[PDB]
């Protein structure tokens, strides 16, 4: 399963942010780690950002990077831009059932 912390994440534009997940069972299968990260912008369906822990999907800006070992994986946004707000979700694919993290809402700190 999965645990995502933090729940809310106030961040200023330009800031860096880090969202992490811990799986209750390992998500490594055949030498790969089935861990992905989704962004659900408000009012839309979710979309893929990184898969297999660190692979940036085509279309995703270098923004975003993923990493992690054993049971803890982290998504990092170097420079937060306006379009990046919404709820992020981690999800693992190692074992069945497939499971998603509870979500981390990123809100843009503004004046």
């Amino acid at each position: 399963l999965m645990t995502q912390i933090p729940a809310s994440l106030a961040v200023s534009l330009g800031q860096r942010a880090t969202i992490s997940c811990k799986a209750s069972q390992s998500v490594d299968y055949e030498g790969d780690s089935y861990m992905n990260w989704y962004q659900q912008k408000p009012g839309q369906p979710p979309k893929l950002l990184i898969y297999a822990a660190s692979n940036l999907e085509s279309g995703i800006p270098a923004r975003f990077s993923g990493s992690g070992s054993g049971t803890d994986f982290t998504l990092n946004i170097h420079p937060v831009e306006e379009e990046d707000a919404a709820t992020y979700y981690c999800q693992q694919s190692n074992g069945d059932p497939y499971t998603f993290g509870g979500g981390t809402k990123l809100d843009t700190k503004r004046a």
Binding site: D32, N36, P45, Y51, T87, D96, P97, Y98, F100, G103
Partner: protein, 111 residues
Amino acid sequence: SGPELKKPGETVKISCKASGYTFTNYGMNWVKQAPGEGLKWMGWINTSSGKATYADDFKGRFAFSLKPSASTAYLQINNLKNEDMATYFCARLGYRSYFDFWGQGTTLTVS
């Protein structure tokens, strides 16, 4: 499609039309999102043998299936409970960890 309002215990069959591509070469997943924004895995199936697997949550009530010719994925919800209320997505599976696209939703409401 196939969503809408249903009284507790009802029956409902959700569909999912795929395109761009051949429906039998990649797998598919029914995932829902409840009104409080939580995401849940509903069912996973191999599109070729027609054999699905499910969490306990819907075990024995939901039945996933497909048509590799007509390019259709199905979810046959039975004995609906109030907690099945949510947006339902499908999503084309890519590689072995994630999903390529692609559903825009379809709100089922049990009350």
